[PDB]
Structure 1
Amino acid sequence: IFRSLMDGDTVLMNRPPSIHQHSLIAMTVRILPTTSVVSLNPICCLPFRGDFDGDCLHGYVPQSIQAKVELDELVALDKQLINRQNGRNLLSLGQDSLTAAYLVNVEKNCYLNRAQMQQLQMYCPFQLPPPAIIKASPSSTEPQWTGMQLFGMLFPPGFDYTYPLNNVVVSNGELLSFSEGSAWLRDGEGNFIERLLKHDKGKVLDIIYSAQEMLSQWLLMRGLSVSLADLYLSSDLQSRKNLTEEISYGLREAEQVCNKQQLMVESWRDFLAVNGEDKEEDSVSDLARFCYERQKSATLSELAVSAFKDAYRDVQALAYRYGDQSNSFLIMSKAGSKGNIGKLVQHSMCIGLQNSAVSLSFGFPRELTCAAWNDPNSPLRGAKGKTTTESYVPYGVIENSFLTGLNPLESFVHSVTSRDSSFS
């Protein structure tokens, strides 16, 4: 009495390690013509915390009828719609429907005609809204639809949503207003997915599936790519030169701010007081001694790191000025799909601060040039000119970025800093 596996049966899927109860999800078996591989919806990768790069999923097949009955009533996907860790939604659009929704809600200038709208309606559960755009030119027929009405076909007619932070107003299933922010689409306290789940909780999965299909079709119609113009982060050569000079001056100002902040100790209380001191020039004449004094202490190093980050936030804030609206990296950073602003800064303008949090027997020469490596008195050569030293906390700033290339000393510094990163 043993029949072969077919459609409708439930299996208990799991991905090692099982770090939380949502790794056990009961799914219905669907037969596919493929072989030696299993497939699932990419949105469902979040509960498993797994990618698609060689990750293997091992499943369990119940045999007794009672185990099958209790499997889809407690361990099924529709029963795990609420995350038990924080009370929010468990399933969310992973970076793809997210990117497509951000693009379709931010542009507001790429109208869709009747044919494309009807083609995209096949993947939406609800009907078609009015075009709302009858004429856009004095000699333009064929009234078109707007981008924000395309996303409004995913909401039920009786669904009301309001997100004041992003100025999002949803009334009668229609998206009325949206300014910016890309926060109501990601996972959060007031995301639209959570409100939909709290509204009906009966067809949320179908809505998510239809939205994923429609947004994938729309993105295929548009197309997203990354080219060298995204990494260049400039319109022409003059803009690139201006950006390079601005980055250099910002790094110099950040270093000066760090050196100024390093003087907030008890040894300089006589200098910090409002009096007459003749040693004002000596505090700025010794520029190379500040690095050695910083790398030999821990509290000073932490204060320097904090000051450098505070002064480098403004430096990172230049990509929005020197970047275009159609920048793929900027779009993916604003939408919260993949990456952040700092990664773009390291890609285009400058890597920034590179420091290790372990005690080593060598330091950084603060210059990262050919002359700095050949200096006998540099901190990299064991001791910074002797009174001797025994340990150092490395602290260096790389002016170059990953696009313009890295010097061998800069690559050595980056490797030393990044050696501390390891899962195992």
Structure 2
Amino acid sequence: IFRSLMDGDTVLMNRPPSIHQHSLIAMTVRILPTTSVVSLNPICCLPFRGDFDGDCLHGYVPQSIQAKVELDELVALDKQLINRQNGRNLLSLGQDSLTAAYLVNVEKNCYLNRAQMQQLQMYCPFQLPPPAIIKASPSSTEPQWTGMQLFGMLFPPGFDYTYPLNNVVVSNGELLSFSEGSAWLRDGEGNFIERLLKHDKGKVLDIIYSAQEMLSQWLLMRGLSVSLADLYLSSDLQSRKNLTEEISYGLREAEQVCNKQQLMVESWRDFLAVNGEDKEEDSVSDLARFCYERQKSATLSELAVSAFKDAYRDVQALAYRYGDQSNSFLIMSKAGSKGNIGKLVQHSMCIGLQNSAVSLSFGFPRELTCAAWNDPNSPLRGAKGKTTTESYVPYGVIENSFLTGLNPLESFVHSVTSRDSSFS
């Protein structure tokens, strides 16, 4: 007495290893013409903590009727909507829906006409709002719809949402205001998905699915791409030269700040006091000794890296000044779907600080040039001869970026720094 698998049956999906109890999800079997492969919704990848790069999901088919009855009553997807770890929602918008919603709500200058709005209304479950834009020009007929009303067809009429931080007000199922931040869209304490789940908890999955489909259609209509202009991060060549000079000066200022911070020790208590010291020029002219002293001590290295991060936050802040609003990297960083600002800084302006975790027998020459690698007294050539040292804490700053091209010594420094992450 055996029958083949068909639609409506439930299977227990699991991804090895099971790091949390939400990896076990019961899903209904849907037959597809594709063979030798299983199809999964991209949103459901977050509970499984996996991606589509070779991951294999092994399922379990329950044979007993009681096992099937208990499978969809306790281990089903709708039963696990509340995360048991932090109490928030388990399912998010995703890496694509988040960016699409950010682009819909941030632009506010692209109006959708009647045809496109009606085409996109097929996926949304709710009805069509009033156009709100009757005439945008003296000779413009065919009144259009704003972008924020398109996102308003994803909320029930009785759902009210307020987010003071991003100035987001949702009244009677209509989005009234939004400024920036994109924090309510992402997973958090006061995200809109959590409020929707706490409101009804009966149709949140369908709302999320329809929102994903509509946002995918809208982004296909718009189109998102990454080109060389995004990596250039400049309007023209003069802007690029100005940015390069500004980055160089910022790195020099950060190095000066680190050198100043290195003096906060008990050995320089006589110099830091408000008195008359004739050795003021000695602490400034000794520029090549500060790096050697930093690479030998661990507390000094920690102070130096902390000061470098504090002074390099301002350097990273220049991307919003030298970056346009149409930059794809900036859009994805502000939306929070993928990447951050430091990754963009390393992409375009400069990599920044590069330090290793464990101690090594060599130290970086602080310059990373052709003449530095040939210096017999450089820390990279075993020791600087200032008693002979045996161990060092590498500390290097890379002025170049990936777009310009890494120096071979800079590439060696980057490889030494990144070798730790490849260990088992």
* Helix, strand or coil at the partner of 1:16: coil
Deviation at 1:188, TM superposition (A): 0.1
Deviations 1:69-98 (A, max 9, x none): 000000000000000000000000111110
Contact 1:125 1:210 in 2 (8 A): yes
Give the TM-score normalised by structure 1.
Answer: 1.00
* Helix, strand or coil at the partner of 2:422: coil
Deviations 1:305-337 (A, max 9, x none): 000000000000000000000000000000001
* Helix, strand or coil at the partner of 2:268: helix
Match of 1:407 in 2: 407
* Alignment RMSD (CA, Å): 0.5
Deviation at 1:53, TM superposition (A): 0.4
The alignment status of 1:132 with 2:132, answered yes or no, reads yes
Distance in 1 separating the partners of 2:93 and 2:168: 18
Match of 1:278 in 2: 278
Contact 1:359 1:392 in 2 (8 A): yes
Deviation at 1:141, TM superposition (A): 0.2
Deviation at 1:247, TM superposition (A): 0.1
Distance in 2 separating the partners of 1:393 and 1:358: 7
Match of 2:202 in 1: 202
Deviation at 1:217, TM superposition (A): 0.2
* Helix, strand or coil at the partner of 1:57: strand
Match of 1:57 in 2: 57
* Helix, strand or coil at the partner of 2:368: coil
Contact 1:6 1:30 in 2 (8 A): yes
The alignment status of 1:309 with 2:304, answered yes or no, reads no
Deviations 1:86-132 (A, max 9, x none): 00000001111100000000000000000000000000000000000
Deviation at 1:27, TM superposition (A): 0.1
Deviation at 1:422, TM superposition (A): 3.1
Distance in 1 separating the partners of 2:94 and 2:130: 30
Contact 1:354 1:413 in 2 (8 A): yes
Deviations 1:354-394 (A, max 9, x none): 00011100000000000000000000000013500010000
Distance in 2 separating the partners of 1:286 and 1:321: 35
Contact 1:120 1:214 in 2 (8 A): yes
Contact 1:166 1:179 in 2 (8 A): yes
Distance in 1 separating the partners of 2:378 and 2:178: 56
Equivalenced residue count is 424
* Helix, strand or coil at the partner of 1:165: coil
Distance in 2 separating the partners of 1:423 and 1:379: 26
Contact 1:378 1:385 in 2 (8 A): no
Identical positions, percent? 100
* Helix, strand or coil at the partner of 1:26: strand
Match of 1:91 in 2: 91
Contact 1:376 1:385 in 2 (8 A): no
Distance in 2 separating the partners of 1:11 and 1:70: 12
Distance in 1 separating the partners of 2:422 and 2:134: 58
* Helix, strand or coil at the partner of 1:11: strand
Distance in 2 separating the partners of 1:300 and 1:40: 51
Distance in 2 separating the partners of 1:344 and 1:105: 23
Contact 1:8 1:30 in 2 (8 A): yes
Match of 2:11 in 1: 11
Distance in 2 separating the partners of 1:100 and 1:386: 58
Distance in 1 separating the partners of 2:42 and 2:403: 32
Contact 1:100 1:216 in 2 (8 A): yes
Give the TM-score normalised by structure 2.
Answer: 1.00
Match of 1:323 in 2: 323
Deviation at 1:423, TM superposition (A): 6.5
Contact 1:160 1:170 in 2 (8 A): yes
* Helix, strand or coil at the partner of 1:162: strand
Distance in 2 separating the partners of 1:385 and 1:422: 33
Distance in 2 separating the partners of 1:390 and 1:381: 12
Deviation at 1:25, TM superposition (A): 0.1
Q: Could you list the structure 1 runs, at least 4 aligned residues long, displaced by more than 2 angstroms after superposition.
A: none
Distance in 1 separating the partners of 2:324 and 2:28: 46
